[PDB]
Amino acid sequence: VVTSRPKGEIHSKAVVIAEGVNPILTMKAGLRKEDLKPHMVAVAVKEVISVPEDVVNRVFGVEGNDGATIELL
């Protein structure tokens, strides 16, 4: 592995490309013969909203480190 660091050259017997989506480093290894087309990916926009620990209990119907997940269609 070569890095953006100045003296950065890490030697290894194997390299695990666990770098997620945007397969920039996968294309350098010969895998991913093309880039991602805009039908293999989904733009996911997320907000983390500060809701003060008791309205979370009220609007989800839970209490005390028990959680609920909503899936919105």
């Binding site: 953006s4 989506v21 945007n22 920039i24 880039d35 991602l36 805009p38 990916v41 733009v43 983390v48």
Partner: protein, 92 residues
């Protein structure tokens, strides 16, 4: 104005001397492109098509990668920012 209110909430270490979003050919964005999907699908309003060219406000880039993929002609030299640079998501 609107989304830079929400980009102010994020934490950045901006690398201003190294723009990680370069456009390979500005002429493709003027006559070859019709709808400019880099502008209309950027979650951080990085791209803005003026008549002076394309204004790439790379400092607010959320490093998602949509612009590189949604661009039909491939003329976005898209990199991640360097290590310890770009978005720094706290409670991501």
């Amino acid at each position: 104005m609107r989304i830079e209110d929400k980009l102010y909430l994020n934490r950045y270490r901006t690398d201003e001397e190294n723009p990680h979003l370069k456009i390979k050919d500005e002429s493709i964005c003027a006559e070859k492109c019709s709808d400019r999907p880099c502008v209309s699908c950027c979650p951080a309003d990085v791209y803005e098509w003026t008549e002076s060219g394309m204004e790439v406000k790379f400092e607010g880039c959320l490093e998602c990668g949509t612009c590189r993929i949604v661009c039909p002609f491939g003329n976005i030299e898209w990199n991640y920012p360097r290590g310890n640079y770009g978005v720094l998501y706290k409670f991501g």
